[PDB]
Amino acid sequence: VRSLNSIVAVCQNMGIGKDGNLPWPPLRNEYKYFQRMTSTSHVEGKQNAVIMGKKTWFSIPEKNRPLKDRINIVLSRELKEAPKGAHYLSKSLDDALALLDSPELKSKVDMVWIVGGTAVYKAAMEKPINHRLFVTRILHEFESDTFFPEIDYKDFKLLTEYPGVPADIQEEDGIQYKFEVYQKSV
Ligand SMILES: NC(=O)C1=CN([C@@H]2O[C@H](COP(=O)(O)OP(=O)(O)OC[C@H]3O[C@@H](n4cnc5c(N)ncnc54)[C@H](OP(=O)(O)O)[C@@H]3O)[C@@H](O)[C@H]2O)C=CC1
Ligand SMILES: [Ca+2]
Secondary structure, rough: OEEEEEEEEOOOOOOOEOOOOOOOOHHHHHHHHHHHHHHHOOOOOOEEEEEEEEHHHHHHHHHHHOOOOEEEEOOOOOOOOOOOOOEEOOOOOOHHHHHHOOOOHOOOOOEEEEEOOHHHHHHHOOOOEEEEEEEEEOOOOOHHHHHOOOOOOOOOOOOEEEEEEEEOOOEEEEEEEEEEEEEEOO
């Protein structure tokens, strides 16, 4: 795979989850952003793939699984078979990458998105491959029990602009947030 993309929303404490769910109540516009960015393919006949850990898969309401219009790959060292509704099960990020490179997948897949959690982000960030990280920074603090790993600011450079990503601070439900894009070139 030529390049990876990761997307996450974090609060001021770098928190991403609390008790199996998000630390903050629902933000409609943030959700729409995730859906659009991960579902949009730049090529006809192809779809994007999303890779996620097991607790992230089960955090999605059952009736909404798998994430529509994307090939869903779940990572787990314990499961024997892909959970009901998932397209593929992999035992490491490396296996999932290999999978994608395979014949069947290769022609069917456009972009690859990493959608969490912690260990999934961390493994993707360590690969010496071109990578774009789409971060939503929610400018408030919420209690969290699961955090985003540290990003190497020497490697991942913050872009000042990116096509189709609003620059300004956004606000919804009395909460402000900003979209940032960081890029690592390999
Ligand atoms: N704010 C945001 O952007 C996001 C927030 N969330 C939140 O994060 C939490 C879920 O995240 P987290 O707790 O970190 O869990 P994960 O979703 O990463 O699930 C962890 C499990 O996934 C498997 N796994 C994870 N990484 C790997 C790997 N590299 N290779 C193989 N298996 C792997 C293992 O399963 P096994 O034990 O079976 O081996 C591990 O126990 C929830 O609160 C969710 O709501 C999630 C995504 C994005
Ligand atoms: Ca486990």
